[PDB]
């Protein structure tokens, strides 16, 4: 996260760290959506241009974390993966269209002050909140700058951007399964996700029922926090039918 701040304790209890076993390192962010299911970006698990293709046993899920590097004894919980599910029409060849994957845990994780699932949006909540100017919140342990790494979880609030502005900021083909967020050059304020934040949640707090909803997944961007560029996010509601299909069949 570039130009964000330290998270408060328990601020984002759905935040998940995807952790590579060997070598031990941060792979991606992710989110807890039930006691057995974790949501992330497909490109965190599968991206052939970078020779990335992780299998279940390559990875661990670390939940309830604040510190990036510490083993947070008695606070974090570490889970093994039973199965990875990548969207069947995830487009890794071109533009990361449908950049979404589910991971089922081998065992349910115990909820605590630091560990709690986020809501997934219904159509109405999506329609109400996914509007240009409305702000969401992105969290992660990724890079503090495009070109180091934070001591603890970082947070930044960013406005959703008009789709034509998103489209005009890039040569990459944008789809309805994406949205973009971030400040314009003229708006003064700054902030963006960056590498390492991939797969983490873009969340919004519904003013109707005061619950947090995950509207987006950190997906891609050209550099980090560049003037005139925006962060792009997987549109979670647009792919919720797939999410529900996987959980209904395998959960």
């Amino acid at each position: 996260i570039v130009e964000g701040s330290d998270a408060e304790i328990g601020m984002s209890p759905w935040q998940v760290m995807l952790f590579r076993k060997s070598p031990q390192e941060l792979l991606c962010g992710a989110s807890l959506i039930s006691d057995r299911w974790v949501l992330t970006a497909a490109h965190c698990l599968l991206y052939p241009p970078w020779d990335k293709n992780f299998t279940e046993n390559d990875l661990l899920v670390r939940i309830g974390k604040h510190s990036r590097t510490r083993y947070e004894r008695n606070i974090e919980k570490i889970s093994m993966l039973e199965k990875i599910y990548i969207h069947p029409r995830y487009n890794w060849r071109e533009n990361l269209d449908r950049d979404i994957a589910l991971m089922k845990l081998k065992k349910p994780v115990a909820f605590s002050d630091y560990i709690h699932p986020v809501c997934l949006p219904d159509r109405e909540t999506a329609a109400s909140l996914l509007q240009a100017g409305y702000k969401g919140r992105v969290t992660g342990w990724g890079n503090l700058k495009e070109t180091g790494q934070p001591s603890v979880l970082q947070v930044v609030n960013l406005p959703i951007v008009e789709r034509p502005v998103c489209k005009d900021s890039t040569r990459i083909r944008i789809t309805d399964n994406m949205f973009c967020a971030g400040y314009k050059p003229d708006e003064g304020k700054r902030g963006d996700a960056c590498e390492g934040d991939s797969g983490g949640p873009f969340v919004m707090k519904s003013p109707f029922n005061n619950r947090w909803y995950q509207m987006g997944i950190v997906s891609w961007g050209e550099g980090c926090d560049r003037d005139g560029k925006y962060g792009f996010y997987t549109h979670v509601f647009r792919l919720k039918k797939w999410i529900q299909k996987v959980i209904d069949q395998f959960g």
Binding site: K21, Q24, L26, L60, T69, R70, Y71, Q149
Partner: peptide, 11 residues
Amino acid sequence: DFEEIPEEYLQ
């Protein structure tokens, strides 16, 4: 840079 995690999670 990462602190070692308990061996039980790596077996």
